Amino acid sequence: EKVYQVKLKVYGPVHIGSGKIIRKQEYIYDRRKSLAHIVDGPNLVKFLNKKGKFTAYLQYLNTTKERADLYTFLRQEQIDTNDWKTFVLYTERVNQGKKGMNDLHLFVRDGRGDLYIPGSSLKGALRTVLEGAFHSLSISDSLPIDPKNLAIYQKIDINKELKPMPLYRECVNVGTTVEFTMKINSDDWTIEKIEKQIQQAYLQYWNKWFVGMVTTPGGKAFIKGGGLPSVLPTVLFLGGGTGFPSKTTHYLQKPKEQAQKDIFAILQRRFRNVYGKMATVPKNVPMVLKGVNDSTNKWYQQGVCLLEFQP
């Protein structure tokens, strides 16, 4: 069974969902800092009972149920940042697309707590492309990545406009390279075949859905800001929040009109409030593109990565 090193470069930030979403009240975000401090709840609680401010915390959250940010409260009580460090697990830069972060999706971490990409996630991303076996393909868990390459990126819905959604996802930063080891059986999989399939699937994704998405005014704004890099080859979307055109094989196997109609029927059946009320197939199915931006105001497509294979 041939073994190939698999290097993944993240063109656009990737969030693999640990399975945990944290409310703004749980974390500390300072807009001027542009830094969010992840706080282990039980320790913060214990700290606030020790200081006697726990009653004040409870009254604060009750007073403003819709907005319960910790930063505000901690500032209101004049608690020093040195005092904060005790109940702060770590700190990560924030790429806000709007103000105050509404909620945070935390990246997946092991029992040791090092950030890593599950070989299961990569395998599934490849499998979506390569369908058309799967015990012969082997994908390993990623080598743990340095936390310096993790930041929070705002979720922006791009459909005739760029609207920042109330979702924030810790994501592997752009430029970061993730290393995996792939083992394949010559009688089932050839690495040239895998790479060619991925390239063809990308091309199908680009010509059937991406171009129509660009034609919308929000897509034009996304492209003007640098949303589509020139290099974007072999492209795999491994991130959460990428969208319906990936993770499904409709655009990879069906004609553009046929694939659009089938996906539209699927969305009408599953989401009867957004697409069920609609009576006609729109220009793009699904309607909305997913995008992150940066402080340099450079836009990135969510979860877009380039895959390199070496013998």
Binding site: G19, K20, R23, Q25, G41, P42, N43, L44, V45, K46, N49, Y57, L58, L61, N62, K65, E66, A68
Partner: protein
């Protein structure tokens, strides 16, 4: 576990009873749309279940019969997390006040035993299961 107001024990049977009491038909547009606890949905219930499950796994991995200090701190956070959720959503508030979960966590804290925490976790699990059953 504990006895509620008007002298009713907390049981999985009581979980079924409290889930079915707050069930209302409320048919809309000639179609039946079941609503629980004045509109509580399954997503909020699953969120609360995840809150429970983290500490449940932590306790289940432990061998001692007494809750450790970190378990007690997690239960205090659980009290805070329920209060934050009850605040934002009226349906979550109604569910919490009808199921007496925010008081059962205090009962578990005072008992300071693995068995009482496991039974409370089972009770919350039965709440989720019976909400799924009556949906």
């Amino acid at each position: 576990l504990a006895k509620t107001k008007t002298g009713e024990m907390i049981d999985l049977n009581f979980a079924r009873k409290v889930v079915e009491e707050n069930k209302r038909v409320k048919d809309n547009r000639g179609r039946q749309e079941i609503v629980l606890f004045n509109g509580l949905t399954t997503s909020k219930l699953r969120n609360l279940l995840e809150l429970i499950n983290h500490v449940y796994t932590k306790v289940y991995n432990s061998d001692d019969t007494t809750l450790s200090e970190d378990v007690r701190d997690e239960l205090e956070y659980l009290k805070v997390k329920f209060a934050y959720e009850s605040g934002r959503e009226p349906a979550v508030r109604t569910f919490i006040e009808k199921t007496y979960v925010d008081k059962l966590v205090d009962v578990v804290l005072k008992k300071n035993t693995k068995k009482i925490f496991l039974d409370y976790c089972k009770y919350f699990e039965a709440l989720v299961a019976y909400a799924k059953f009556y949906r």
